[PDB]
Amino acid sequence: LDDVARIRLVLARELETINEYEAYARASSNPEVRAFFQHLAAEEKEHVSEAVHMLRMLDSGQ
Amino acid sequence: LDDVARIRLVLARELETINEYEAYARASSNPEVRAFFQHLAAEEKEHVSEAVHMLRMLDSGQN
Amino acid sequence: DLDDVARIRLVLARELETINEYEAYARASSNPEVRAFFQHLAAEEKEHVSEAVHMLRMLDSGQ
Amino acid sequence: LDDVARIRLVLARELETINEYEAYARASSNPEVRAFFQHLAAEEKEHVSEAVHMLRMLD
Amino acid sequence: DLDDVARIRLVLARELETINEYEAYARASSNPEVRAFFQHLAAEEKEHVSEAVHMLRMLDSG
Amino acid sequence: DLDDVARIRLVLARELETINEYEAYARASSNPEVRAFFQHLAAEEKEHVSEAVHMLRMLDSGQN
Amino acid sequence: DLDDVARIRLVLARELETINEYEAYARASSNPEVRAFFQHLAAEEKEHVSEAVHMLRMLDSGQNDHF
Amino acid sequence: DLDDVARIRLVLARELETINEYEAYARASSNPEVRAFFQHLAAEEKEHVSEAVHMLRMLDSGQNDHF
Amino acid sequence: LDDVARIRLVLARELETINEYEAYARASSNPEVRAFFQHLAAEEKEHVSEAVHMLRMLD
Amino acid sequence: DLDDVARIRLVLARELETINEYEAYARASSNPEVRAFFQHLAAEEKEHVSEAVHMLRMLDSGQNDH
Ligand SMILES: [Ca+2]
Ligand SMILES: [Ca+2]
Ligand SMILES: [Ca+2]
Ligand SMILES: [Ca+2]
Ligand SMILES: [Ca+2]
Ligand SMILES: [Ca+2]
Ligand SMILES: [Ca+2]
Ligand SMILES: [Ca+2]
Ligand SMILES: [Ca+2]
Ligand SMILES: [Ca+2]
Ligand SMILES: [Fe+3]
Ligand SMILES: [Fe+3]
Ligand SMILES: [Fe+3]
Ligand SMILES: [Fe+3]
Ligand SMILES: [Fe+3]
Ligand SMILES: [Fe+3]
Ligand SMILES: [Fe+3]
Ligand SMILES: [Fe+3]
Ligand SMILES: [Fe+3]
Ligand SMILES: [Fe+3]
Ligand SMILES: [Fe+3]
Ligand SMILES: [Fe+3]
Ligand SMILES: [Fe+3]
Ligand SMILES: [Fe+3]
Ligand SMILES: [Fe+3]
Ligand SMILES: [Fe+3]
Ligand SMILES: [Fe+3]
Ligand SMILES: [Fe+3]
Ligand SMILES: [Fe+3]
């Protein structure tokens, strides 16, 4: 398990987390809860872009 | 489920995620990768603060 | 490779899931004694969550 | 899942929680953390006594 | 890492889950002889639970 | 989507894993009294395994 | 921390779950050839279960006592 | 939510894991007769894998194309 | 764990992945997404064939 | 309760773990033919990852905007 492997693991986890945030926002009729989850999902998408950048830098094949 | 239970689940997951980020920062010998994981850990702790706030708002018994 | 803060986070995550279970089981019971047993368990677990959040804040500057 | 089944599940989870609290108390070097976990283990053991009693009453 | 008390707790937790499974299977069974089989197994496992609690209280003052 | 035979097989499989656990925990030792407790649990579980195999045999004509 | 008898018990437990899966898949199929494929697999796994029980009995005298 | 081909793929995947377990147990075993029991089980599970690959190729023309 | 066992693990994972891709193709709304998943399934079937060949040659 | 973008995210996450497995199995192998086999599988999976990230960007404007 090297650095690129840990980056891939973090990216995979972030993608699943976004899925969870979107599903939980959809399940709520509370506007404040939906806003909470939409903000979290946006911050997680930022993290995804950052991880993909690090992966492309560190992985030649990617 | 209901909203409070899903918030509790989100908080539990975020706490495990911080553990992972900090562990990966420790495991790396590349300083850039270490810094990446430390930055991720800091922002996830902010997410934890937000979630605890939501829980306190929505759970009278917790606040 | 875990430190004290990682173990506190794990305990807190487990407690949040435990509260979910207690409140669900309190709801699913129609026996007042059992519903009440589970409600008392959930209140005590919420107390544990507050204590663990305090520990986390006291040992983690990023939090 | 009836009431007695849910109590058995809670009791089993409480027993694993005690094991985890005691292991984490053993593993910590900060004394305050270490006592935090010991306090949690004592409280959970009291929970176990209550659950055993409830199980005896209903079963 | 584990000591005798921790192993006894694990055994007790497992026995409790086992009783739940035996009782659920008795409820779901069609053949009344199979139902009787699962009911008997549940009763014997409950006796084991009593014994495990006794051990745990002999070896743990708290 | 489980029938009676499938539940018997699940119970038998669980009992076999339980015996493994009792034997490993007896080996872990530390206290003779704890070892004897785990050994007694293992012996009674073996009784259950035999009865479950016989059940399976009457109910499963392909197994018998 | 496994000895030979524990590995035998583990194989037997896995085989029993596998038979459950084969019988369930045979029931869930509408193609008769696929149904028959799963039923044949189930019968062969049951033969393996018999062999595993014989091995367990030969290695575990306390278990053999109940047969 | 599963068709027959997906159930065949699941059975094949499980058989492959089962072979791994049997070969590992054969390597770990001390009694030569237990070692041989596990080797016997591994050889017969490999035969099942061959049979299931043939079934999958018969049911999945896209898979058969690559053989 | 030896080379043949790792090949078996890869093959078992690839078979589960094909199941997932076909399910997602059935479930998808957008035609391009359906086609994306079906194309992934086809490529994975090629990977399955390669792994079976390797396994037959080495075992 | 899954939409197309969620299924894309799930496939991408699975491919990333698959690449990890292929690379670790290449490292753990002593037979050069097996090692090259696993490296080849990893390269092809990485191409799959590029395709999926492109699909994700097209389906998720919030992700496209980074
Ligand atoms: Ca995450
Ligand atoms: Ca998270
Ligand atoms: Ca807890
Ligand atoms: Ca607990
Ligand atoms: Ca048990
Ligand atoms: Ca058992
Ligand atoms: Ca099997
Ligand atoms: Ca198998
Ligand atoms: Ca795959
Ligand atoms: Ca994959
Ligand atoms: Fe994150
Ligand atoms: Fe997050
Ligand atoms: Fe950021
Ligand atoms: Fe952030
Ligand atoms: Fe607690
Ligand atoms: Fe509790
Ligand atoms: Fe308490
Ligand atoms: Fe028992
Ligand atoms: Fe039993
Ligand atoms: Fe008994
Ligand atoms: Fe009996
Ligand atoms: Fe056979
Ligand atoms: Fe077999
Ligand atoms: Fe055979
Ligand atoms: Fe088989
Ligand atoms: Fe692949
Ligand atoms: Fe490809
Ligand atoms: Fe793929
Ligand atoms: Fe392509």
Q: DSSP secondary structure string, chain C?
A: ---HHHHHHHHHHHHHHHHHHHHHHHHH--SHHHHHHHHHHHHHHHHHHHHHHHHHHHH-TT-
CA-closest candidate to residue F21, choices J45, E17, H16: E17
Q: Which chains touch J (3 or more CB pairs under 8 A)?
A: A, I
User: What residues have CB less than 8 Å from J52, skipping those under 6 apart?
Assistant: J8, J11, J12, J15
Q: Smallest Cα–Cα separation from A10: which of J54, E48, B38?
A: B38
Phi and psi based region of residue F30 (left: phi greater than 0; alpha: psi -120 to 50; beta: remaining)? left
Quick check: helix, strand or coil at residue F64?
Answer: coil
Residues from chain A that touch J60, judged by Cβ atoms under 8 A, are 45
Task: Tell me which residue range forms the domain holding C23.
Answer: 4-59
- Tell me which chain A residue has its CA closest to the CA of residue J54: A52
What are the structure tokens assigned to D22, written together?
């005691």
CB contacts of G43 in chain F (<8 Å) are 62
Facing F63 at nearest CB: one of G10, G17, G46:
G46
**Residue F62 contacts G, CB cutoff 8 Å:** yes
All residues with CB under 5 Å from ion ligand 9: I 13-14, 17; J 18
* Maximum pairwise Cα distance, chain J: 46
Residue pair G8/H34 in contact (Cβ under 8 Å)? The answer is yes
Find chains touching chain D: ≥3 CB pairs under 8 Å. C, E
- Say if the Cβ atoms of E31 and F55 lie within 8 Å: no
Could you tell me the two tokens for C7?
A: 């173990």
Structural domain includes residue B8: yes
Q: What are phi and psi of C62, to 5 degrees?
A: -65, -20
| Candidates H9, H19, H23; nearest CB to I19 | H9
On whether the CB atoms of residues F17 and F9 are closer than 8 A, the answer is no
Put simply, the answer to whether C1 touches B48 (Cβ < 8 Å) is no
Residues of chain H contacting I19 with CB distance shorter than 8 Å: 2, 6, 9-10
Q: How was this structure determined?
A: X-ray
Dist CA G50 CA A3 (whole Å): 49
Contact B23, C6 (CB under 8 A): yes
Q: Which residues, at least 6 apart from I58, have a Cβ–Cβ distance to it below 8 Å?
A: I3, I4, I7, J31, J34
Both tokens of residue C33? 């004694």
Torsion, Cα of H38, H41, H45, H48 (10° steps): 170
For ligand 18, the distance from its centroid to the CA atom of residue E45, given in whole angstroms, is 6
Would you say the C-alpha torsion D11, D17, D19, D22 has a positive or negative sign? Answer: negative
Ligand lying closest to the C-alpha of residue G42: 25
- Give the number of other Cβ atoms within 10 Å of residue D46's Cβ: 12
Residue A60 carries which DSSP code? Answer: S
* CA within 13 Å, CB half, A43: 18
The count of structural domains within chain C is 1
Residue J54 falls inside a structural domain:
yes
Asked if J22 lies within 8 A of I10 by C-beta distance, the reply is yes
CB-closest option in D10, D29, D50 to C25? D10
Contact H49, H13 (CB under 8 A): no
Residue H29, min C-alpha distance to chain G (Å): 6
Q: At what angle do helices B3-27 and B31-58 cross, to 10 degrees?
A: 160
The answer to whether the CB of E22 falls within 8 A of the CB of D11 is no
User: Residue E15's closest CA among E39, E46, E38, E40?
Assistant: E46
J54 interface with I at CB cutoff 8 Å: no
B38 touching A (Cβ < 8 Å): no
B31-61 b/e with 16+ CB inside 10 Å = b?
Answer: eebbebbbebbebbbebbebbbebbeebbee
Q: How deeply is E27 buried, as exposed, middle or buried, from its count of CB atoms within 10 A (0-12, 13-18, 19+)?
A: exposed
* DSSP H or E stretch at residue B52: helix B31-58
Q: Which residue of G has its CA nearest to H1?
A: G28
E56 within 8 A of E9, measured Cβ to Cβ: yes
User: Cβ distance H53 to H12 under 8 Å?
Assistant: yes
How far does residue I40's CA lie from ligand 28's centre (Å)?
6
Our CA-based measurement puts residue E62 at a distance from the nearest CA of chain F, in whole angstroms, of 18
Shortest Cα distance, chain I CAs vs residue J44, angstroms: 9
In this structure, the number of other CB atoms found within 10 A of the CB of residue D49 comes to 12
CB contact (8 A) between residue B58 and residue A33: yes
Are F1 and G27 an interchain contact pair (Cβ–Cβ within 8 Å)? yes
Nearest ligand to residue B43 Cα: 14
Are I and J neighbours with ≥3 CB pairs closer than 8 A?
Answer: yes
Check the CA dihedral G6-G8-G14-G19 and report its sign: negative
HSE of F57 in the Cβ direction (CA atoms, 13 Å)?
Answer: 11
Question: How many angstroms does the Cα of residue I55 sit away from the middle of ligand 27?
Answer: 19
Which of G17, G25, G60 should we substitute to test contact with H (largest number of H Cβ atoms within 10 Å)? G25
DSSP state of B30: S
> Burial of C4 by CB count in 10 Å (0-12 exposed, 13-18 middle, 19+ buried)?
buried
Spacing, Cα I29 to ligand 8 middle (Å): 36
Is-contact J42 J23, C-beta < 8 A? yes
Beta carbons of C46 and B23 less than 8 Å apart:
no
Residue G21's CB is within 10 A of a number of other CB atoms, namely 18
Task: Say whether H20 and I5 touch across the interface (CB within 8 A).
Answer: yes
Question: Checking phi first, is residue E55 left (phi over 0); if not, alpha (psi -120 to 50) or beta?
Answer: alpha
Contact D52, D25 (CB under 8 A): no
Alpha carbon distances (Å) from F19 to E15, F42, G9, G65: 12, 5, 8, 16
Closest Cα to residue I8, out of H37, H15, H65, J43? H15
**Contact at CB, H2 and G28, closer than 8 angstroms:** yes
Q: Which residues contact F20 (CB under 8 A, 6 or more apart)?
A: G2, G6, G9, G10
Under DSSP, is residue J57 helix (H, G, I), strand (E, B) or coil? helix
| CB I45, CB H66: distance < 8 Å | yes
Q: Which amino acid is at B51?
A: A
Q: Which residues contact F40 (CB under 8 A, 6 or more apart)?
A: none
